[PDB]
């Protein structure tokens, strides 16, 4: 078992950043394959041994990550991505913080050569494929915690940005199908978990708190002056007094930018806050340079000298109160004892300035001249109030400066990382946060691929997944996605001369285009199955009404939707819309397309689509369908003015007979019927037929007597 540790240390020595030039790349790809095989043979039980677990966790992920961003060849990158994916699949339970950084850097390189991006996508693809619940599982395991990134949503956002045909310049032609496979697999996963559960039964508080926190962080970074009382508004703080607000800043400094705190503390009105900000920290038993280092880790230095003056004043004044006074044993023979020095406020104030100068000139590259060790000790001759500092004071600080510089790129970011570590119905409920933050993007990309592409096979899969998305939006009560889907499909159907089995401009445009066929079928396939009318909005009602009216414009839709009403009231069928010329010009390819359209509408069950099922029968449909009436003769629409009015009227009578609100809604439709009945000299049969409907409305309504009087008179 020690042999295993020695062998894995040797494999670490094979592949690493430091041991780059010694061994060739054939050795490195071979070592990657070896580590892959070692993980594969036993990875479930590899976690138990901590001496080995540190070796496979901490220092080998360095070798993994360092040669994704920096490498340029393809062969090594293949094996490294193989090892990475196997590590994700096998050891996904633990090893959670380190993996997030490499996914973040993966998407960073992906979003911003050609073949390398294809290899990246093609290799990382298997995570969603072999684990269809990967997007959910990463959300449970990683997203729900308050801290860390939010790369679960960014995964789908990155796939969405990569999915379009617009990425020809960014990536080669193989990427879009590969990412679109997982993009469609996401929606296809949900129908597996829908069959069991009904709508009414359904009808992550930590995530709610995280959303509140992230919005507060965004506002606080945008404007701390308003953000502070806004932070009090959310109840995350004890009170307005500066003690609690100052306590908030130190604990959660990892997420906040340094510049925000720097500009917040710079203003003169908030200088009193510095009386209590530094009071929390206490550097007793530590030298001034270490305390200055911890201070510089917490915020960024300003640029203006006058602004810097008050900050240095507060910093220097804060140290004095921490330490008491025992200075009577001044001497130069001391060997690392601090308490003998107990300077005044001015002494620490002057001591602060000379310490910071070494970083921005000697270590800075722009300035070439160097002020030596001589002139630094030469500066303060008789500057600390008539008595000089001891000459062993500055040498220790200069030695402490010379070892390491302060940092306000890649290696240093790991330093904060390890310090964090070292020191069925329920799934649906935990769902509904995924779709809210990605749904518009997913439907936009699906529609973009559907409208740009031309192959039938891709488009059928697209429209089916589109219907899956529509069902998903229907199960919850989003009512912003669903209207977008149905409205854009309504635009996409392509229904917004001498005819004869008619032939028409809209008909021939329908038949010649395959795109409209699937849209018209699947659209009323959505309308067939529904469980509430309120999700529809006014615009979609206008769209479907315009669809049915445009179909009535030609002899496509047979207006015999309700034979029961006509058989009750004993009228013939409504008069057909009277086309031009009839015999059995067009020839060859004109008719053969259009007849197919005459087939396809019959496949939609258009009569029983929106009117058949009772779910869509509501006040909105009647109220807008009466608005749809033209009420105006024109030479352009003289073909069908006499018939559209009768069709609309009878269709509304049948619709109103179903609704049980038999008190209010009848008044509006009776009003519009009598307003419609007085058109300019409409023909005899129309006025003949309209009075039967008018008597029926008078029967339906209650206490509508004036209209009956006018009807008689």
């Amino acid at each position: 078992l020690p042999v295993v540790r020695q062998y894995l240390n040797l494999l670490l020595s094979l592949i690493a950043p430091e041991n780059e030039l010694k061994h060739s790349y054939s050795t490195r790809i071979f070592g990657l394959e070896l580590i892959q095989t070692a993980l594969e043979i036993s990875g479930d039980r590899l976690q138990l041994y901590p001496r080995l677990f540190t070796l496979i966790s901490d220092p080998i992920f360095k070798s993994i990550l360092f040669i994704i961003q920096n490498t340029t060849k393809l062969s090594l990158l293949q094996a490294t991505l193989q090892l990475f994916t196997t590590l994700v699949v096998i050891l996904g339970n633990n090893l959670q913080l380190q993996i997030e950084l490499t996914l973040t850097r993966i998407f960073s390189i992906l979003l911003d050569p050609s073949i390398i991006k294809e290899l990246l996508i093609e290799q990382i693809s298997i995570l969603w494929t072999r684990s269809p619940s990967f997007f959910t599982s990463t959300f449970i395991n990683f997203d729900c915690n308050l801290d860390r990134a939010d790369v679960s949503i960014n995964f789908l956002k990155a796939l969405t940005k990569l999915a379009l045909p617009e990425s020809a310049l960014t990536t080669t032609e193989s990427v879009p199908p590969i990412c679109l496979e997982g993009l469609v697999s996401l929606v296809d996963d949900m129908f597996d978990h829908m069959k069991d559960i009904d709508r009414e039964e359904f009808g992550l508080k930590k995530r709610d708190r995280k959303t509140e926190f992230i919005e507060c962080t965004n506002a606080f970074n945008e404007k701390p002056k308003k953000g502070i009382p806004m932070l009090i508004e959310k109840g995350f703080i004890a009170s307005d007094s500066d003690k609690d607000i100052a306590e908030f800043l130190f604990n959660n400094n990892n997420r906040m930018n340094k510049k925000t705190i720097g500009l917040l503390l710079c203003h003169p009105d908030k200088v009193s806050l510095l009386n209590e900000y530094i009071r929390l920290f206490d550097f007793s038993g530590l030298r001034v340079d270490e305390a200055i280092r911890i201070l510089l880790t917490k915020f960024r230095l300003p640029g203006e000298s006058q602004q810097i003056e008050r900050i240095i004043e507060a910093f220097s004044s804060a140290y004095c109160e921490n330490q008491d006074y025992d200075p009577s044993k001044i001497s130069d023979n001391a060997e690392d004892d601090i308490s003998t020095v107990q300077p005044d406020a001015d002494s620490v104030f002057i001591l602060s300035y000379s310490i910071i100068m070494l970083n921005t000139d000697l270590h800075n590259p722009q300035v070439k001249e160097h002020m030596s060790f001589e002139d630094y000790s030469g500066n303060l001759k008789g500057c600390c109030n008539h008595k000089d500092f001891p000459f062993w004071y500055l040498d220790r600080i200069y030695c402490s400066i010379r070892d390491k510089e302060i940092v306000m790129w890649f290696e240093d970011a790991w330093n904060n990382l390890i310090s964090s570590t070292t020191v069925p119905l329920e799934l649906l409920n935990f769902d509904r946060a995924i779709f809210k933050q990605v749904g518009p993007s997913i439907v936009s990309t699906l529609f973009n691929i559907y409208v740009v592409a031309s192959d039938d096979h891709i488009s059928t899969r697209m429209i089916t997944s589109l219907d899956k998305c529509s069902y998903i939006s229907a199960f919850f009560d989003f009512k912003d996605l669903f209207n977008d889907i149905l409205n854009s499909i309504a635009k996409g159907t392509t229904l917004i001369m001498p005819l004869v089995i008619p032939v028409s401009t809209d008909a021939v445009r329908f038949g010649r285009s395959f795109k409209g066929q699937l849209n018209t079928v699947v659209f009323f396939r959505i309308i067939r199955r529904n469980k509430d009318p309120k999700i529809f909005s006014k615009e979609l009602w206008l769209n479907i009404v315009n669809i049915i009216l445009t179909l009535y414009e030609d002899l496509i839709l047979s207006p015999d939707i309700f034979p029961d009403l006509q058989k009750r009231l004993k009228l013939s069928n409504l008069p057909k819309p009277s086309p031009e010329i009839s015999i059995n010009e067009p020839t060859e390819e004109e008719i053969k397309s259009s007849k197919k359209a005459m087939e396809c509408i019959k496949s939609s069950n258009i009569a029983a689509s929106v009117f058949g099922n009772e779910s869509n029968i509501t006040a909105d449909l009647i109220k807008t369908l009466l608005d749809s009436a033209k009420t105006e003769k024109n030479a352009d629409n003289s073909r069908y003015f006499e018939a559209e009015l009768l069709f609309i009227i009878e269709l509304t009578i049948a619709l109103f007979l179903f609704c049980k609100e038999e008190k209010e809604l009848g008044k509006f439709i009776l009003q519009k019927v009598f307003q419609l009945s007085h058109t300019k000299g409409l023909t005899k049969r129309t006025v003949r037929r309209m009075l039967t409907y008018k008597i029926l409305l008078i029967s339906l309504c209650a206490d509508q007597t004036e209209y009956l009087s006018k009807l008689i008179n």
Binding site: T37, E40, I41, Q78, Q82, T85, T86, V89, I90, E122, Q123, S125, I126, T129, R130, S131, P132
Partner: protein, 169 residues
């Protein structure tokens, strides 16, 4: 797990009638929860189609043979797998016919060693081991190849002779 086969499928797909078979194989093995009832001749048949034919360059054949060796070494096919006997029959059967510079033949020889020496090699039909012995003897007797491959041939034939005559007990 049994996710290794899909990974090798995407690895071999980068070759730029067989690519269609491999993509069908990937779409089929999207399925989870082990290989299960899969009729295990078909889980790896397109790999045998690569090595069996004689119209593909050596690089793809080497990749396919590496995939086969990976499957056997990790023991993807086991006693629990349906029709494992037929699959391990077919994999030795295909290698005897035409193939393919010399490293490909050594890979075939090493895989033959590993298959025959293991327990599953006992399940091969007695009409097949003669073909394997004929192939290895043709490699060993011929001198046009490199000498080190001939020595590898010598060692494998000694090993499989010991394994065969041990069964005579």
């Amino acid at each position: 797990p049994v996710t290794i086969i899909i990974k090798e499928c995407i690895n071999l797909s980068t070759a730029m009638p067989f690519l269609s078979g491999f993509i069908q194989l990937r779409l089929m093995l999207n399925k989870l929860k082990n290989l299960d009832n899969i009729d295990s001749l078909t889980i790896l048949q397109p790999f045998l189609l690569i090595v069996s034919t004689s119209s593909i360059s050596g690089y793809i054949t080497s990749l396919a043979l590496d995939s086969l060796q990976k499957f056997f070494t990790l023991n993807i096919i086991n006693e629990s797998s349906q029709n494992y006997i037929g699959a391990h029959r077919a994999t030795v059967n295909a290698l005897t016919h035409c193939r393919f510079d010399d490293s490909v033949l050594l890979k075939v020889v090493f895989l033959l060693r590993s298959i025959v020496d293991s327990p599953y090699g006992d399940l091969l039909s007695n009409s097949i081991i003669y073909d394997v012995l004929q192939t290895i003897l043709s490699l060993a007797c011929n001198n046009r190849r490199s000498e080190v491959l001939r020595n590898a041939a010598q060692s494998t034939m000694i090993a499989v002779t010991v394994k065969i005559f041990s069964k005579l007990k």
